[PDB]
Design an enzyme around this catalytic site. Sequence first.
Site, short mmCIF file in Angstrom:
data_model
loop_
_atom_site.label_atom_id
_atom_site.label_comp_id
_atom_site.label_asym_id
_atom_site.label_seq_id
_atom_site.Cartn_x
_atom_site.Cartn_y
_atom_site.Cartn_z
N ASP B 25 9.59 1.77 9.59
CA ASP B 25 9.28 0.49 9.67
C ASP B 25 9.78 -0.75 10.20
OD1 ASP B 25 8.51 -1.49 8.07
OD2 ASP B 25 9.48 -1.04 5.87
N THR B 26 8.85 -0.89 11.21
CA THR B 26 9.27 -1.93 12.55
C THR B 26 9.48 -2.81 11.80
OG1 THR B 26 7.40 -1.71 13.09
CG2 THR B 26 8.31 -0.38 14.03
N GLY B 27 8.97 -3.46 10.78
CA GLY B 27 9.16 -4.31 10.60
C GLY B 27 10.21 -4.84 9.34
C1 0KJ Z 1 6.25 -0.68 1.10
C2 0KJ Z 1 7.38 -0.87 1.92
C3 0KJ Z 1 7.21 -2.14 2.71
C4 0KJ Z 1 8.51 -2.39 1.81
C5 0KJ Z 1 5.76 -2.70 3.25
N1 0KJ Z 1 6.06 -4.16 3.71
C6 0KJ Z 1 6.03 -4.43 5.07
C7 0KJ Z 1 7.46 -3.88 5.75
O1 0KJ Z 1 8.10 -4.26 7.23
C8 0KJ Z 1 8.19 -5.51 4.93
C9 0KJ Z 1 7.51 -6.72 6.15
C10 0KJ Z 1 8.49 -8.30 5.84
C11 0KJ Z 1 8.98 -9.03 6.67
C12 0KJ Z 1 9.64 -10.21 6.55
C13 0KJ Z 1 9.60 -10.55 5.33
C14 0KJ Z 1 8.68 -10.10 4.51
C15 0KJ Z 1 8.28 -8.62 4.35
N2 0KJ Z 1 10.12 -5.94 5.41
C16 0KJ Z 1 10.94 -5.97 4.24
O2 0KJ Z 1 10.75 -5.72 2.84
O3 0KJ Z 1 12.17 -5.70 4.97
C17 0KJ Z 1 12.78 -6.25 3.85
C18 0KJ Z 1 13.89 -7.82 4.77
C19 0KJ Z 1 12.76 -9.06 4.99
C20 0KJ Z 1 12.41 -8.51 6.37
C21 0KJ Z 1 13.46 -7.28 6.92
O4 0KJ Z 1 13.86 -7.73 8.16
N3 0KJ Z 1 14.14 -6.92 6.12
S1 0KJ Z 1 5.62 -5.10 2.82
O5 0KJ Z 1 5.82 -5.76 1.58
O6 0KJ Z 1 5.53 -6.66 3.80
C22 0KJ Z 1 3.75 -4.94 2.96
C23 0KJ Z 1 3.05 -4.99 4.08
C24 0KJ Z 1 1.77 -4.41 3.70
C25 0KJ Z 1 0.80 -4.13 3.25
N4 0KJ Z 1 -0.01 -3.46 2.97
C26 0KJ Z 1 -0.63 -3.09 1.74
S2 0KJ Z 1 0.76 -3.21 0.60
C27 0KJ Z 1 1.52 -3.72 1.97
C28 0KJ Z 1 3.27 -4.39 1.64
#
Ligand code: 0KJ
Lengths: 99, 99
Positions: B25-27
Amino acid sequence: PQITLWKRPLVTIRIGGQLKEALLDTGADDTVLEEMNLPGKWKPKMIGGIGGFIKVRQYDQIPIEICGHKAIGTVLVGPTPVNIIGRNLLTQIGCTLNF
Amino acid sequence: PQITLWKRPLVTIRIGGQLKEALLDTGADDTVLEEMNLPGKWKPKMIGGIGGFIKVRQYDQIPIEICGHKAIGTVLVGPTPVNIIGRNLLTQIGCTLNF
Ligand SMILES: CC[C@H](C)CN(C[C@@H](O)[C@H](Cc1ccccc1)NC(=O)OC[C@@H]1CCC(=O)N1)S(=O)(=O)c1ccc2ncsc2c1
Protein backbone atom coordinates in the site's frame (compact mmCIF):
# COMPACT_ATOMS: atom_id res chain seq x y z
CA PRO A 1 9.76 7.00 -14.37
CA GLN A 2 10.73 5.29 -11.14
CA ILE A 3 9.26 6.69 -7.94
CA THR A 4 10.87 5.71 -4.62
CA LEU A 5 8.77 5.56 -1.48
CA TRP A 6 10.90 7.54 0.97
CA LYS A 7 8.21 10.19 0.75
CA ARG A 8 4.53 10.11 -0.24
CA PRO A 9 4.27 9.34 -3.97
CA LEU A 10 2.48 12.56 -4.95
CA VAL A 11 2.26 13.47 -8.61
CA THR A 12 0.40 16.04 -10.68
CA ILE A 13 -2.84 14.97 -12.36
CA ARG A 14 -5.24 16.88 -14.59
CA ILE A 15 -8.97 16.32 -14.34
CA GLY A 16 -11.94 18.34 -15.49
CA GLY A 17 -9.47 21.04 -16.53
CA GLN A 18 -7.87 21.35 -13.07
CA LEU A 19 -4.30 20.35 -12.17
CA LYS A 20 -4.11 18.66 -8.75
CA GLU A 21 -1.62 16.75 -6.59
CA ALA A 22 -2.57 13.13 -6.02
CA LEU A 23 -1.17 10.07 -4.30
CA LEU A 24 -0.22 7.07 -6.46
CA ASP A 25 -1.94 4.53 -4.24
CA THR A 26 -1.60 0.79 -4.84
CA GLY A 27 -3.80 0.13 -1.77
CA ALA A 28 -6.77 1.96 -3.37
CA ASP A 29 -9.07 -0.04 -5.65
CA ASP A 30 -10.73 3.14 -6.88
CA THR A 31 -9.67 6.73 -7.51
CA VAL A 32 -11.00 9.18 -4.88
CA LEU A 33 -10.79 12.92 -5.34
CA GLU A 34 -11.31 15.75 -2.96
CA GLU A 35 -14.60 17.56 -3.29
CA MET A 36 -14.92 19.19 -6.72
CA ASN A 37 -17.94 20.23 -8.71
CA LEU A 38 -17.70 17.96 -11.76
CA PRO A 39 -20.37 18.12 -14.46
CA GLY A 40 -22.36 15.02 -15.44
CA LYS A 41 -24.43 12.22 -14.01
CA TRP A 42 -23.21 10.36 -10.93
CA LYS A 43 -24.24 7.51 -8.62
CA PRO A 44 -24.00 7.46 -4.81
CA LYS A 45 -21.44 5.11 -3.30
CA MET A 46 -19.91 4.30 0.08
CA ILE A 47 -16.23 3.39 0.36
CA GLY A 48 -14.40 2.09 3.39
CA GLY A 49 -10.96 2.53 4.85
CA ILE A 50 -9.23 3.12 8.14
CA GLY A 51 -11.75 4.82 10.41
CA GLY A 52 -14.84 3.65 8.51
CA PHE A 53 -16.80 4.71 5.44
CA ILE A 54 -17.32 7.93 3.55
CA LYS A 55 -20.04 8.83 1.09
CA VAL A 56 -18.84 9.69 -2.41
CA ARG A 57 -20.23 10.55 -5.84
CA GLN A 58 -19.27 8.11 -8.60
CA TYR A 59 -18.58 9.71 -12.01
CA ASP A 60 -17.75 7.46 -14.97
CA GLN A 61 -15.60 7.88 -18.08
CA ILE A 62 -13.77 10.95 -16.73
CA PRO A 63 -10.48 11.75 -18.51
CA ILE A 64 -7.55 12.00 -16.05
CA GLU A 65 -3.95 12.73 -17.06
CA ILE A 66 -1.42 11.46 -14.52
CA CYS A 67 2.16 12.75 -14.97
CA GLY A 68 1.52 13.20 -18.70
CA HIS A 69 0.04 9.70 -19.09
CA LYS A 70 -3.59 9.79 -20.23
CA ALA A 71 -6.27 7.73 -18.54
CA ILE A 72 -10.04 7.65 -18.52
CA GLY A 73 -12.30 6.05 -16.00
CA THR A 74 -14.33 6.17 -12.88
CA VAL A 75 -13.60 8.89 -10.33
CA LEU A 76 -15.17 9.06 -6.85
CA VAL A 77 -15.64 12.54 -5.39
CA GLY A 78 -16.09 13.11 -1.70
CA PRO A 79 -14.62 14.30 1.60
CA THR A 80 -11.28 12.56 1.34
CA PRO A 81 -8.34 14.48 2.85
CA VAL A 82 -6.10 13.60 -0.11
CA ASN A 83 -6.55 12.96 -3.81
CA ILE A 84 -5.99 9.26 -4.34
CA ILE A 85 -5.14 7.65 -7.68
CA GLY A 86 -6.25 4.04 -7.38
CA ARG A 87 -5.60 0.89 -9.37
CA ASN A 88 -8.38 1.58 -11.87
CA LEU A 89 -6.20 4.36 -13.34
CA LEU A 90 -2.76 3.09 -12.28
CA THR A 91 -3.17 0.06 -14.58
CA GLN A 92 -4.01 2.38 -17.48
CA ILE A 93 -0.70 4.24 -17.15
CA GLY A 94 1.31 0.99 -16.88
CA CYS A 95 2.23 1.43 -13.25
CA THR A 96 3.78 -1.53 -11.44
CA LEU A 97 5.36 -2.25 -8.07
CA ASN A 98 8.91 -3.60 -8.27
CA PHE A 99 11.36 -5.06 -5.76
CA PRO B 1 9.16 -9.37 -8.52
CA GLN B 2 7.27 -6.98 -10.75
CA ILE B 3 3.64 -6.69 -9.60
CA THR B 4 0.94 -5.30 -11.84
CA LEU B 5 -2.21 -3.74 -10.46
CA TRP B 6 -5.17 -5.32 -12.26
CA LYS B 7 -5.60 -7.26 -8.97
CA ARG B 8 -4.94 -6.13 -5.40
CA PRO B 9 -1.19 -6.43 -4.67
CA LEU B 10 -1.60 -8.95 -1.86
CA VAL B 11 1.46 -10.88 -0.69
CA THR B 12 2.28 -13.39 2.00
CA ILE B 13 4.20 -12.02 4.97
CA ARG B 14 5.83 -13.72 7.97
CA ILE B 15 5.62 -11.94 11.38
CA GLY B 16 6.02 -13.08 15.01
CA GLY B 17 6.39 -16.52 13.44
CA GLN B 18 3.01 -16.51 11.65
CA LEU B 19 1.96 -16.21 7.99
CA LYS B 20 -0.53 -13.57 6.87
CA GLU B 21 -1.74 -11.94 3.66
CA ALA B 22 -1.13 -8.21 3.38
CA LEU B 23 -1.66 -5.45 0.85
CA LEU B 24 1.28 -3.51 -0.57
CA ASP B 25 0.00 0.00 0.00
CA THR B 26 1.95 2.98 -1.30
CA GLY B 27 -0.77 5.32 0.04
CA ALA B 28 0.05 4.40 3.65
CA ASP B 29 3.03 5.89 5.49
CA ASP B 30 2.90 3.07 8.03
CA THR B 31 2.30 -0.65 8.19
CA VAL B 32 -0.99 -1.52 9.94
CA LEU B 33 -2.03 -5.08 10.75
CA GLU B 34 -5.35 -6.40 12.01
CA GLU B 35 -5.56 -7.27 15.68
CA MET B 36 -2.98 -9.86 16.72
CA ASN B 37 -0.56 -10.57 19.55
CA LEU B 38 3.06 -9.46 19.16
CA PRO B 39 5.76 -9.76 21.79
CA GLY B 40 7.34 -6.83 23.61
CA LYS B 41 6.24 -3.38 24.70
CA TRP B 42 3.85 -1.33 22.60
CA LYS B 43 2.81 2.32 22.78
CA PRO B 44 -0.78 3.53 22.25
CA LYS B 45 -1.06 5.67 19.09
CA MET B 46 -3.77 7.08 16.86
CA ILE B 47 -3.82 7.09 13.06
CA GLY B 48 -6.27 8.51 10.55
CA GLY B 49 -7.53 7.23 7.24
CA ILE B 50 -10.26 7.98 4.79
CA GLY B 51 -13.02 7.23 7.29
CA GLY B 52 -11.56 8.89 10.39
CA PHE B 53 -9.23 7.96 13.24
CA ILE B 54 -8.56 4.69 15.02
CA LYS B 55 -6.53 3.59 18.01
CA VAL B 56 -3.59 1.31 17.37
CA ARG B 57 -0.75 -0.32 19.28
CA GLN B 58 2.68 0.69 18.01
CA TYR B 59 5.34 -2.05 18.07
CA ASP B 60 8.86 -0.96 17.13
CA GLN B 61 11.72 -2.85 15.48
CA ILE B 62 9.65 -5.89 14.48
CA PRO B 63 11.03 -8.30 11.86
CA ILE B 64 8.65 -8.86 8.91
CA GLU B 65 9.47 -10.99 5.89
CA ILE B 66 7.54 -9.71 2.87
CA CYS B 67 7.35 -11.93 -0.19
CA GLY B 68 10.81 -13.26 0.80
CA HIS B 69 12.41 -9.89 1.56
CA LYS B 70 13.47 -8.95 5.08
CA ALA B 71 12.37 -5.81 6.89
CA ILE B 72 12.63 -4.75 10.54
CA GLY B 73 10.57 -1.80 11.61
CA THR B 74 7.44 -0.32 13.06
CA VAL B 75 4.19 -2.30 12.92
CA LEU B 76 0.90 -0.78 14.05
CA VAL B 77 -1.79 -3.18 15.22
CA GLY B 78 -5.48 -2.31 15.30
CA PRO B 79 -8.83 -2.27 13.50
CA THR B 80 -7.65 -1.70 9.97
CA PRO B 81 -10.00 -3.16 7.32
CA VAL B 82 -7.12 -5.23 5.92
CA ASN B 83 -3.45 -5.87 6.66
CA ILE B 84 -1.41 -3.14 4.94
CA ILE B 85 2.31 -2.89 4.26
CA GLY B 86 3.12 0.80 4.23
CA ARG B 87 6.03 2.83 2.96
CA ASN B 88 8.05 2.34 6.17
CA LEU B 89 8.63 -1.29 5.17
CA LEU B 90 8.22 -1.02 1.39
CA THR B 91 11.35 1.18 1.39
CA GLN B 92 13.24 -1.50 3.34
CA ILE B 93 12.55 -4.16 0.73
CA GLY B 94 13.55 -1.79 -2.10
CA CYS B 95 10.04 -1.36 -3.48
CA THR B 96 9.45 1.35 -6.11
CA LEU B 97 6.59 2.45 -8.37
CA ASN B 98 7.40 2.26 -12.07
CA PHE B 99 5.59 3.36 -15.22
C1 0KJ C 1 -8.48 -0.91 2.70
C2 0KJ C 1 -7.04 -0.56 2.37
C3 0KJ C 1 -6.72 0.93 2.53
C4 0KJ C 1 -6.87 1.34 3.99
C5 0KJ C 1 -7.59 1.74 1.55
N1 0KJ C 1 -7.23 3.18 1.56
C6 0KJ C 1 -6.05 3.47 0.71
C7 0KJ C 1 -4.86 3.81 1.61
O1 0KJ C 1 -3.68 3.87 0.80
C8 0KJ C 1 -5.03 5.12 2.38
C9 0KJ C 1 -4.92 6.38 1.51
C10 0KJ C 1 -5.15 7.64 2.33
C11 0KJ C 1 -4.13 8.57 2.46
C12 0KJ C 1 -4.33 9.74 3.20
C13 0KJ C 1 -5.55 9.97 3.81
C14 0KJ C 1 -6.57 9.04 3.69
C15 0KJ C 1 -6.37 7.89 2.94
N2 0KJ C 1 -4.04 5.21 3.44
C16 0KJ C 1 -4.28 5.13 4.74
O2 0KJ C 1 -5.37 4.92 5.26
O3 0KJ C 1 -3.14 5.35 5.61
C17 0KJ C 1 -3.34 5.60 7.00
C18 0KJ C 1 -2.69 6.94 7.30
C19 0KJ C 1 -3.27 8.08 6.46
C20 0KJ C 1 -2.23 8.41 5.39
C21 0KJ C 1 -1.01 7.66 5.87
O4 0KJ C 1 0.08 7.77 5.36
N3 0KJ C 1 -1.30 6.90 6.91
S1 0KJ C 1 -8.50 4.17 1.32
O5 0KJ C 1 -9.33 4.03 2.50
O6 0KJ C 1 -7.98 5.48 1.11
C22 0KJ C 1 -9.40 3.69 0.02
C23 0KJ C 1 -9.04 4.19 -1.23
C24 0KJ C 1 -9.71 3.79 -2.39
C25 0KJ C 1 -10.76 2.89 -2.32
N4 0KJ C 1 -11.53 2.38 -3.31
C26 0KJ C 1 -12.46 1.53 -2.85
S2 0KJ C 1 -12.46 1.28 -1.13
C27 0KJ C 1 -11.15 2.38 -1.08
C28 0KJ C 1 -10.47 2.78 0.08
